[PDB]
Amino acid sequence: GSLAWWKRELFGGWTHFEAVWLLMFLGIQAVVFVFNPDSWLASVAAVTGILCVVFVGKGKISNYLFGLISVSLYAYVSYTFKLYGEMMLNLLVYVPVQFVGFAMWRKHMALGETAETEEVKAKALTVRQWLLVVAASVVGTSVYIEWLHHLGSALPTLDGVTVVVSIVAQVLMILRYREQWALWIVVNILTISLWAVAWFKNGETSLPLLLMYVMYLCNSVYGYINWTKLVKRHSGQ
Amino acid sequence: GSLAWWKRELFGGWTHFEAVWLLMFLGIQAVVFVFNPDSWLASVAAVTGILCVVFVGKGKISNYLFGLISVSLYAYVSYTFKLYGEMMLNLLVYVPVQFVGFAMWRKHMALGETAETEEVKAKALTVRQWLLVVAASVVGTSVYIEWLHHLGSALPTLDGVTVVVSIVAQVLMILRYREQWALWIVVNILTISLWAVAWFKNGETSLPLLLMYVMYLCNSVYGYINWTKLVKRHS
Amino acid sequence: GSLAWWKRELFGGWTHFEAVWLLMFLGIQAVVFVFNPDSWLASVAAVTGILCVVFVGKGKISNYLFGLISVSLYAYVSYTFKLYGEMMLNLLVYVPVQFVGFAMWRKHMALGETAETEEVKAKALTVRQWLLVVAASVVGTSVYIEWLHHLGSALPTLDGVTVVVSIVAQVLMILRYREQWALWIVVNILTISLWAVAWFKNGETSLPLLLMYVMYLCNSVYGYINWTKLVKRHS
Numbered sequence: 006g007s008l009a010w011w012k013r014e015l016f017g018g019w020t021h022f023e024a025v026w027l028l029m030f031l032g033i034q035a036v037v038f039v040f041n042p043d044s045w046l047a048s049v050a051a052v053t054g055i056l057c058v059v060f061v062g063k064g065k066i067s068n069y070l071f072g073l074i075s076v077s078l079y080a081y082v083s084y085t086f087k088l089y090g091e092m093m094l095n096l097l098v099y100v101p102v103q104f105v106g107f108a109m110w111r112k113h114m115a116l117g118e119t120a121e122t123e124e125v126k127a128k129a130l131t132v133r134q135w136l137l138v139v140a141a142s143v144v145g146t147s148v149y150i151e152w153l154h155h156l157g158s159a160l161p162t163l164d165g166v167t168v169v170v171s172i173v174a175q176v177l178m179i180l181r182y183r184e185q186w187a188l189w190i191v192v193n194i195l196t197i198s199l200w201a202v203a204w205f206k207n208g209e210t211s212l213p214l215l216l217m218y219v220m221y222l223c224n225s226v227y228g229y230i231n232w233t234k235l236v237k238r239h240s241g242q
Numbered sequence: 243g244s245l246a247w248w249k250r251e252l253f254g255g256w257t258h259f260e261a262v263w264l265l266m267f268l269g270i271q272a273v274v275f276v277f278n279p280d281s282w283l284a285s286v287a288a289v290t291g292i293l294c295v296v297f298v299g300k301g302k303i304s305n306y307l308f309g310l311i312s313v314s315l316y317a318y319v320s321y322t323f324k325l326y327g328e329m330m331l332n333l334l335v336y337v338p339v340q341f342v343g344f345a346m347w348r349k350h351m352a353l354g355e356t357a358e359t360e361e362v363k364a365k366a367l368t369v370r371q372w373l374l375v376v377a378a379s380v381v382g383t384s385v386y387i388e389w390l391h392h393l394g395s396a397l398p399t400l401d402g403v404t405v406v407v408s409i410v411a412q413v414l415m416i417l418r419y420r421e422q423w424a425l426w427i428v429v430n431i432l433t434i435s436l437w438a439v440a441w442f443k444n445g446e447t448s449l450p451l452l453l454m455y456v457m458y459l460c461n462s463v464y465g466y467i468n469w470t471k472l473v474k475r476h477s
Numbered sequence: 478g479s480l481a482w483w484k485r486e487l488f489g490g491w492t493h494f495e496a497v498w499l500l501m502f503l504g505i506q507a508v509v510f511v512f513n514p515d516s517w518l519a520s521v522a523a524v525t526g527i528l529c530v531v532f533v534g535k536g537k538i539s540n541y542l543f544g545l546i547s548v549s550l551y552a553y554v555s556y557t558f559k560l561y562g563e564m565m566l567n568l569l570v571y572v573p574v575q576f577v578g579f580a581m582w583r584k585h586m587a588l589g590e591t592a593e594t595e596e597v598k599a600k601a602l603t604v605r606q607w608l609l610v611v612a613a614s615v616v617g618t619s620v621y622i623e624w625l626h627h628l629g630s631a632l633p634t635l636d637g638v639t640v641v642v643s644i645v646a647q648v649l650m651i652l653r654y655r656e657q658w659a660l661w662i663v664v665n666i667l668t669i670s671l672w673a674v675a676w677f678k679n680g681e682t683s684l685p686l687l688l689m690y691v692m693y694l695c696n697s698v699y700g701y702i703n704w705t706k707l708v709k710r711h712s
């Protein structure tokens with residue numbers, strides 16, 4: 006709510022290193038758009054979105070507002086490019102979940118060593134707990150094939166794979182589990198390919214968002230690292 | 243062969259991390275198959291094989307069975323995709339090698355930290371030796387070019403280079419040298435490229451084996467890391 | 478300089494790791510060359526240039542002559558493959574800078590822990606400063622869109638960004654800032670997109686320079702790390 010609050014969330018408790026990379030990420034994004042003012046949409050979709058995931062990596066709650074903008078726009082822009090896997094995913098799943106996420110995260114916040122901001126309390130699945138979730142996804146793959154037969158189905162397999170994985174990832178994330186980042190690393194190497202092949206069928210893609218997914222991949226390694234530090238801050242000792 | 247053994251070898255002394263990844267790798271391989279049951283053959287070549295390399299990372303000697311399955315199936319699958327460089331690599335090189343490797347590793351297994359299972363004893367090349375190993379690889383390339391002049395060759399360079407690099411890594415790996423992992427990281431980047439071209443000449447590549455190799459690269463870093471730990475543990 | 482001094486410069490104060498990845502970076506380049514004596518030009522461009530950037534990484538000064546050879550041959554070669562953003566960047570901007578650079582670094586050398594070689598004294602920007610430098614990059618982009626407008630521009634958006642970013646990185650290098658390597662990590666990822674599209678239009682690319690930029694990416698990460706050590710040694 007508070008501007009004083011907004012000041013904390015946005016500027017509070019970044020390391021130098023986190024600051025450098027975020028600023029450079031917005032820079033490359035600014036510089037790509039000061040070349041292509043025409044696709045202003047996808048460039049907004051990157052800037053809000055780079056901020057979304059960098060904030061998740063930090064465990065900041067105000068990621069969700071950014072996410073809400075970002076996934077919506079992206080949903081449109083991924084349609085205008087005939088990436089149908091990404092379009093139904095962002096619109097139907099990510100857009101409601103932004104609020105759902107804000108709900109359940111909101112309940113589980115905490116200070117962090119500078120106390121200049123609030124970080125979510127991160128949890129760690131066990132191997133057993135994990136082996137279930139992996140199976141869950143393979144089960145619900147057959148369920149994502151049954152569904153979506155309706156209206157026929159026009160999902161190439163790979164456009165398809167990146168979609169199960171993305172839902173499972175999103176689900177661990179709202180649930181505050183560190184293992185989400187292992188999944189995010191796979192959804193990011195996959196979506197980069199999606200926008201890279203899209204540049205051949207038909208011979209086209211959008212640079213702000215293909216570039217966005219490269220910055221996503223980097224950050225998703227940061228996320229895994231930082232979320233580990235986070236899981237310890239709230240554990241056995 | 244002991245059953246109690248295969249229990250240790252297969253499930254013993256994994257970190258939460260290694261576990262969390264090796265499972266997520268197999269899951270993604272599975273989700274891929276629940277989409278295209280059509281070529282299980284490749285999906286199996288991927289599943290057996292992720293395990294191969296994940297097990298070499300660990301210094302686990304049972305890596306060799308998984309490899310034997312993996313490389314043979316792989317040799318076939320790359321043959322159906324006109325990657326004739328790779329199919330001959332697996333067939334003439336890797337398939338006999340699982341055996342030679344198993345031979346030499348077995349004499350140099352050690353306990354490892356939890357005593358829950360055993361690891362190969364890793365060694366480190368020196369800068370001198372490594373320079374020599376690398377020098378060999380260029381000298382040895384003119385030999386791989388003279389050979390294969392015979393029986394003809396549309397040896398595209400990319401396919402060709404990765405075949406030389408792969409042979410040298412394999413030799414170091416059987417010989418239990420850490421530095422294989424450096425070479426592995428490069429053969430993985432090269433081979434990701436082979437399957438990335440295979441879908442322009444022409445239009446069709448295998449997904450499980452494209453994915454397999456992305457995962458191979460991830461793991462080849464863990465490999466490097468983990469073998470440095472192995473070198474410390476055993477001298 | 479002396480023959481005693483050149484022994485220190487080229488062989489002085491390498492970690493076993495840096496040494497292994499260096500000799501191998503050169504090995505893999507040599508091999509792509511034993512396959513295609515066809516254009517050694519790109520190969521010499523690759524070899525010096527790997528040496529250039531590993532040398533920048535180590536904070537060594539004779540990176541500069543290597544850079545000089547590298548950026549020339551390359552600037553030419555990036556012309557013969559019709560990559561015009563890259564050719565103008567290397568010739569007009571880099572060849573001057575190799576000189577400016579040697580001038581400036583020369584003032585700020587220091588020894589470093591083994592007392593073998595001379596490392597440059599690394600500094601770091603603050604977040605405040607970093608904010609300017611990035612915002613500067615944004616202004617200077619529309620200002621480089623003015624400049625280029627005269628006599629037209631066959632500048633794809635991609636090529637255009639990678640020239641902006643590459644200059645800003647090179648300004649940071651000459652001024653001796655650790656933060657250069659974040660930029661380089663982006664230009665190296667961008668320049669592999671460039672030589673990847675160059676393959677498609679028109680149906681052509683050079684392996685030694687596509688490899689070299691993959692080896693650049695690896696080394697640009699090592700760069701960031703070692704320059705962090707390097708800032709710490711010098712307050």
Ligand SMILES: CCCCCCCCO[C@@H]1O[C@H](CO)[C@@H](O)[C@H](O)[C@H]1O
Pocket residue numbers: 015016017018019020024027028121604
């Ligand atoms: C969208 C806003 C995020 C961009 C990066 C902002 C980084 C602010 O950096 C700030 O610098 C100060 C040190 O001088 C520290 O006290 C703060 O903890 C730190 O957050």
Ligand SMILES: CCCCCCCCO[C@@H]1O[C@H](CO)[C@@H](O)[C@H](O)[C@H]1O
Pocket residue numbers: 132252253254255256257261264293358
């Ligand atoms: C081919 C075998 C694939 C499965 C490997 C992951 C299985 C988990 O592995 C095991 O989990 C236990 C958790 O209590 C640990 O105590 C064991 O040391 C560990 O090896």
Ligand SMILES: CCCCCCCCO[C@@H]1O[C@H](CO)[C@@H](O)[C@H](O)[C@H]1O
Pocket residue numbers: 463466467470493494
């Ligand atoms: C991209 C590949 C990542 C490899 C990083 C693994 C760490 C290997 O680095 C190792 O560090 C040791 C001391 O710590 C040294 O004794 C070894 O010479 C060196 O190879």
Ligand SMILES: CCCCCCCCO[C@@H]1O[C@H](CO)[C@@H](O)[C@H](O)[C@H]1O
Pocket residue numbers: 369370487488489490491492496499500528593
């Ligand atoms: C670019 C010219 C050669 C590449 C670097 C060669 C690496 C040599 O590295 C050297 O190896 C010796 C180990 O015996 C050490 O004594 C030296 O301190 C070390 O710097």
Ligand SMILES: NC(=O)c1ccc[n+]([C@@H]2O[C@H](CO)[C@@H](O)[C@H]2O)c1
Pocket residue numbers: 057058061062072076099175178189192193221222224225
């Ligand atoms: N790196 C990622 O893909 C990532 C990481 C953390 C959270 N998310 C969420 O997914 C969507 C973007 O892909 C957003 O809704 C994020 O909240 C993505």
Ligand SMILES: NC(=O)c1ccc[n+]([C@@H]2O[C@H](CO)[C@@H](O)[C@H]2O)c1
Pocket residue numbers: 291294295298309312313336339340412415426429430458459461462
């Ligand atoms: N990551 C790799 O590419 C890798 C790692 C370790 C061993 N290998 C060998 O290649 C075959 C597996 O496909 C086997 O022979 C491995 O010994 C490859």
Ligand SMILES: NC(=O)c1ccc[n+]([C@@H]2O[C@H](CO)[C@@H](O)[C@H]2O)c1
Pocket residue numbers: 526529530533534544547548571647650661662664665693694696697
């Ligand atoms: N890895 C890089 O991109 C890098 C790092 C440090 C310096 N440089 C300079 O760019 C050119 C190399 O192609 C040379 O001028 C380098 O000095 C590049």
